Each structure stands twice: as C-alpha cells, then as structure tokens.
C-alpha cells in the first residue's frame, strides 16, 4: 500500500520526542539537549552531508519566542569561521500549522562542556581554543552584538580542533538601556556587574565569561560557582579580593555598592596557587579578563594581542562585520503572537519553492 509505505517514511522519534524533518533530513541521532532546544544529527539528502538540527517548540512562551527570533535573526546575518551558521530552517507552511521550529546547522562533534568531563587539556590546546573563542567574539562585538551567555556548552568543537560559538538566543545589540532575568541552565559565567544589577552592561560581560571559561579549561572545575548570586559574588570576592574604592564608586547601583562595602575584607588569592601547573602568560591574560571593574576589563582586540596568543594572533585574518547592527526591534515587549508572525516571516526564505 502506498499510504503504508508513506507512513514508514514518516517522522522519526528521538528519546521520545518527535523530529519531523523529512523529506530532506533523515537518519537522525541524538546529540544533546539544552534548556530550550533538542539537538540531533541528521543526513542532509540535498547537500549530502550530516548536519545538526535543533528543535524548539516556542510559541506558548513569550520568552521562548524571543530566543528563537533573536538566534535566527542574528545567526542568519553572521558569517564567520568561528561562529555556527544556519543552513536551513524547517517549519510548517502556514502560521496556523507552525508549532515547532527546527534550526539546521553545520554539524560539530562535541562541545567544550562535554570535552572537559573526559579529559584535561594541554596548554597547547587551551591556547588554540582560547584564540578561536576570542576571534569569533571579535566578530560578534564588531557587529555591536553582545552574546551575553557564553559558557562551555555553547563552544562547539570538531575533530580537527576547530571551535565555533553557538547558542545566540540571548544575544542583543549593545545599547544604553530586566536584563538576563530569564531562565538559564547556568549562571556561573555571568559578570559581577550583572549580579549587582548595575545598569550599563557592555561588551565586557562577554570577556568576563571568556575568563571564566579559560579558568575552567585550566583546572576542569568552574571558577565561580554558587547556588545564588550572593554565593557567586562571595566566590568572586574570595579569589579576586575586595574591590577598590575607585572600582566601587564606578558602580551605578548604590544598593549593591553599599552591601559590598559591608562585606568583610578579602585579600586577592594569587592565580598560581589556584592554577599551579598553568602557563604564566595564560594567567596574566586570565587576570585581565577576570577584572572586577568592567571599564578596566581587557577588550577583545587587546586580548587577541596578548603575549599568550602571539603564535595565533593575526589581525589580517581576524575579520569583522561589514556594518554594526542597529537596534530597531525592541522585541522584548512584543507579544508572543507578534513574535510568531516575525519568526514566520524571518523563516519564509527557506520554504520549499520560495
């Protein structure tokens, strides 16, 4: 029976979840699952290669719609060796029938979170991985975009040591204006200025995150974990020591400034005691990325030029975006019904026969 033969070719199920990505994508296999999306590898029968596919089911939640739309708009506009690309986007032909969105990407082999569960990296690999993180970040920042959620699990790696940044659902254009109150699986990579509810978040929040990641590559343990922001801030102070007076009155939030001032003194702990086997140039750059004052924190192009990365630094081959993005959306107040229409519009170009 033709119908019986059609149902055999129907949607595959992975770990109990439906993945309706035929006819183009077949032979699905589980990769991973974030807080929002379910990721499988699949065979692309048109381009004849395996790909990664992330399924999101967002339309009942304003916050899921924001993440879906932001990731799609930003990654479709980015093109960089160290940033994951979107190859295709699968969804239903009518807005009425669209309930899931599948984002199709180049397939990577693992992520740095998984890799650090299984092995201690040599200094040479840490150096090259850190270079690539910063090289991709240089491009992101050149577009005037903040990633805002860098962490080991969204640094993808392949079998030839190539690294790509992914997971752009929180990425935003920088602007002087409830930041990062939405749920995330881990807050351990967030800059202290976010925890203190200072107002003017800048590119420096991403550099902090990269400093946390470097620390974790050096010891295979998170450097500033904690149950609550209070606990994380106490771990930051327990290592960096108490902030200076100059650093304090650079904080906009009078309330947070007051609490820190009440805290008992903490002396800075030297990095070589936390990381005794680590390269001293890696610890110098680490120190400059984990500086409390965001105004003093090293910038991405300065970090690329640091002596630790000198064998990879090449400004002639560290490309930037053609134009910095402008903020003309303010989609953080749009209702999820409006967000769904925009997602539908943004994904129309991938529909068969467009």
């Amino acid at each position: 029976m033709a119908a019986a033969a059609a149902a055999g070719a129907g949607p595959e199920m992975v770990r109990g979840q439906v993945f309706d990505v035929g006819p183009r994508y077949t032979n699905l296999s589980y990769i991973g699952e974030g807080a929002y999306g379910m990721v499988c590898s699949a065979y692309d029968n048109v381009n004849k290669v395996r790909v990664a596919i992330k399924k999101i089911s967002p339309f009942e939640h304003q916050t899921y719609c924001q993440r879906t739309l932001r990731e799609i708009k930003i990654l479709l506009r980015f093109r960089h060796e160290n940033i994951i690309g979107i190859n295709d986007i699968i969804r239903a032909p009518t807005i009425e029938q669209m309930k899931d969105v599948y984002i199709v990407q180049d397939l990577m082999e693992t992520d740095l979170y998984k890799l650090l569960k299984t092995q201690h990296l040599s200094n040479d690999h840490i150096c090259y991985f850190l270079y690539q993180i910063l090289r991709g970040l240089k491009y992101i920042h050149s577009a005037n975009v903040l990633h805002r959620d860098l962490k080991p699990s969204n640094l993808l790696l392949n079998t030839t040591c190539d690294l790509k940044i992914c997971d752009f659902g929180l990425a935003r254009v920088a602007d002087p204006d409830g930041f990062l109150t939405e749920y995330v699986a881990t807050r351990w990579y967030r800059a202290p200025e976010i925890m203190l509810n200072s107002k003017g978040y800048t590119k420096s929040i991403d550099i902090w995150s990269v400093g946390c990641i470097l620390a974790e590559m050096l010891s295979n343990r998170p450097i500033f974990p904690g149950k609550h922001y209070l606990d994380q801030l106490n771990h930051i102070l327990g290592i960096l020591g108490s902030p200076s007076q100059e650093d304090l009155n650079c904080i906009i939030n009078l309330k947070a400034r007051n609490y820190l001032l009440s805290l008992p003194h903490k002396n800075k702990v030297p990095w070589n005691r936390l990381f005794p086997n680590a390269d001293s140039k890696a610890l110098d750059l680490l120190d400059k990325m984990l500086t409390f004052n965001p105004h003093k924190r090293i910038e991405v192009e300065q970090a690329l030029a640091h002596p630790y990365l000198e064998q990879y630094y090449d400004p002639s081959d560290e490309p930037i975006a053609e134009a910095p993005f402008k903020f003309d959306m303010e989609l953080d107040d749009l209702p999820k019904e409006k967000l769904k229409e925009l997602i539908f519009e943004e994904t129309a170009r991938f529909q068969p026969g467009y």
Binding site: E109, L121, H125, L157, T160, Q311
Partner: peptide, 17 residues
C-alpha cells in the same frame, strides 16, 4: 573525543610570512 596539526586555521597561522 580524541583531540593542532590538521586544523585549517592553524595551518594558515603556521605558514604566515
């Protein structure tokens, strides 16, 4: 995963100048 010699970007950096 089993992890500088085979990466394309690393080759460009080795062979600059």
């Amino acid at each position: 995963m089993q992890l500088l010699d085979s990466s394309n970007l690393a080759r460009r950096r080795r062979r600059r100048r």
